[PDB]
Symmetry: D2
Subunit: 245 residues, 4 copies
């Protein structure tokens, strides 16, 4: 009676090397894990070492099928009816400069979550995409130039069928004033400077353009789109978010 | 054409004066200030959030947060919006043997929210405590591993719950609470007290949540605890949400 | 013999409310402190609670005279021949918008250090100043627009006579493509957009212009100037620093 | 007209493969890559630092760092420059009773530096350990407060000192070292061992520094330890520099 069920208990911020397979290829990265299970009112404690045992023994490449298997195996190993695994890591993608064709990596921040509830599995994801934002107000009121800055666009979603990390990346980067590259030659820098100027967007415009795409995707049951613009003229950020439905 | 749930400014740093039941203090806040944006409206008016903060010189407390949130949604011409303010919060404590006084620091957020002329508020408090392991003590012939823990309480009520109240709910339940200033007899007392009161992370979250369930001002809450286990390089963690 | 002196021992990241007085006025802020003393080979340990005792008992406003007194009192209280107090905090200054005249605060990050060595006192400081940087290459090669971004300029210095926090701020902000304001009306935004465009500067130009000023100041015995530009076109930073002499 | 000590790129994130004495692993690095800039030269050539990393596919180790730093100062047409690479580093450990194996994570930086055709290298390793308080144990009738500690070793040598070597120097000296995976008999062993080997932060830094002084490959070093005291909300800290 005095006793209460605990929504989630286990371990948090275990750092662990992982290999990840997505549609575009396989890559090695380093993750932080939070691994937890439901604890019924009657049980005193969970078994904390079994969460680490699980990661040490499962050597398969991570993908959405493997995260499912892993979460199902965890709840079984932990003797629980419910649990979550959240895995956060940097994610690299090969990019090509818009004029030179010179290739370089860009880095994104990703989290993947698997959740079991009484035999039912659900999965969600989050991706932070760094883009260039350029202010339409600045350009319009100014006889020359326009302020611009890096922005972090964060998409969180839950879907029934799998949605690829790269697909979330493309939905955002398609919409940005201009996207980022690690390696830019002189013509590419001329290209990005001009495109961003040509395509100014408020933080409001950015969240709306991405949200439109996500609403259209039949896989997506709910989402949040945030955008944060590190305003180059202020020392605080412009911020917006849309949650759906 | 889509409405935007919230749009405005994030992580504006700003000095504030804060009034609570035990007194007034000066601290430094981060603010996030946002309003609802209707489907066909192009943008909000970003400079007005800063203007509002620059103009209002009054001490912060729950009544002044309400007033600032009202005035914001008015000034921005919106039907809804939210103000969240985060800051370090200091409280004077008394060492348990010497009685020598010293401050402790806690992390607090308060949030006010207007939706179509109705107001709601909520708060969050991170209280650092000592945790000590019952399995370690029971299995070992001497000693018990122990570590700092960060206990985070988020709650929503209608009547005001004081920051100090949330702190007390938690410190009362910890294996032992923290102090900045401890003499040798104080160190002895805290060492023994934690060792006499071992708690798993499970125990800590159940013990705090029971106290909050008993407080009938509280509509809903989350209690989390993260224990920086001194024998691992990762943490034990738990949370309860209610209802 | 087996025993070794310890350069510095004490406490680190004590968070503590402070009141600070500089040339422009007095303000309340929150600091992190690191307070340490020298430990001779022969002594087993220092007295850790006395560092907190010291902060709890000294209720005077902080300024360079008070940091001196505080460091001298610490080494005496700790029974040591040498020690350091480092105090880090956000620092607010009142600013005025360049067209409207509308006033707002801006926030800077500051550290002040006091050091005793056998009766001799020395003090140093560091200030991070967030500014706008605008790329000359971008503007010159582009038919319109120029990429720009927040930059953090960090000045560290040691001096014999006191150098005010605001003076370090002015040395940097005087040199920037354009400086930041919290509150900007439409004409002010037109003003800052244009000024930054009119005054493009590489990270190299920025460190050089600030360093020139610091070399000229007779108070300053040594310094480091760093600048980091959060390139709005990349996901890494452009960075430079000058150390002198 | 002023020369600039170092100019280039900072916190480029980049996946790397790392080879050490115990094996090869894949990790993710932050890089800072800079060159000296002569007084009358206007700017460096920023895109070339990224090109250099994109082109060189070789496994990282001390010989490859030297080679990358040589090639950089060549490609940038500078007389001096520095490459620093920071990453999490994993090592497989054996629990002290069960022998069950599990990884532990450490934070590493390696730095290479060219000055007028001469090369130097240096390294930094943060090793997390358990610390346990001798005063707490001595004064208390039972128990002893203990906590995670972050021990950071920075060193410069000419002959290569392995990352695992620095880790061993430190773990050997801690009240007890950390493991990710511990069974009940392992938890008992580590609890007792720390309690049998209490050390102040002073003790830890002297004990490590003595080991490093004895390693005649080492030209200079700094040992710091920060102990996240489980009875306070602040840390004990010490450092030694040598010579
Ligand atoms: Zn703008
Ligand atoms: Zn335990
Ligand atoms: Zn540029
Ligand atoms: Zn102690």
């Amino acid at each position: 009676l005095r006793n209460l069920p605990i929504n989630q208990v286990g371990i948090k911020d275990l750092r662990f090397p992982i290999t990840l397979k997505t549609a575009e290829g396989t890559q090695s990265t380093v993750a932080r894990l939070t691994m937890t299970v439901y604890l019924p009112a009657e049980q005193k404690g969970t078994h904390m070492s079994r969460f680490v045992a699980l990661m040490e023994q499962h050597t398969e490449v991570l993908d959405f099928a493997q995260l499912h298997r892993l979460t199902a195996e965890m709840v079984a190993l932990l003797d629980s009816r419910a649990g979550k695994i959240s895995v956060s890591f940097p994610f690299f993608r090969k990019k090509t400069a818009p004029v030179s064709g010179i290739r370089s990596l860009l880095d994104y921040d990703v989290s993947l979550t698997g959740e079991m509830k009484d035999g039912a599995y659900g999965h969600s994801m989050k991706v932070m995409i760094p883009v260039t934002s350029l202010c339409p107000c600045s350009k319009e009121i100014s006889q020359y130039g326009a302020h611009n800055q890096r922005s972090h666009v964060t998409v969180s979603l839950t879907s029934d069928a799998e949605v690829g990390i790269e697909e979330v990346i493309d939905y955002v980067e398609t919409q940005a004033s201009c996207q980022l590259y690690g390696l830019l030659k002189r013509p590419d820098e001329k290209y990005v400077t001009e495109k961003a100027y040509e395509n100014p967007k408020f933080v409001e415009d950015m969240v709306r353009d991405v949200a439109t795409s996500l609403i259209a995707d039949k896989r997506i049951k709910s989402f949040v789109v945030e955008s944060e613009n590190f305003e180059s003229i202020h020392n605080h950020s412009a911020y917006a978010y849309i949650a759906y439905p």
